[PDB]
Specification:
It is classed as hydrolase. The structure is a monomer. Helices cover 53% and strands 23% of the residues. By secondary structure, the protein is α+β, with helices and mostly antiparallel strands. The chain has a single domain, classed as Ribosomal Protein L30, Chain: A (2-Layer Sandwich), CATH 3.30.1390.10. It has a 3-stranded antiparallel sheet. Helix 1 packs across helix 2. The longest helix has 17 residues.
Amino acid sequence: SMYKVILVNDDYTPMEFVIDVLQKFFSYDVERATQLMLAVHYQGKAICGVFTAEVAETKVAMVNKYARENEHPLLCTLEKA
């Protein structure tokens, strides 16, 4: 089993922060990060990758922790692929 890791839309997290997260935690360049951000905003969410269970778990925890440390509500989730 592999797991999707997803970012979900919200009304407060700034664009530049979503881009930052996509680069830091998912290794996307600016253009692709920005595309994924567009999907977050207009599809309501974007799948950012597929990973092993333990890697997905760790990524979800770390992205959410990073977001809250900067007082943003950005929500990262996992689900079975």
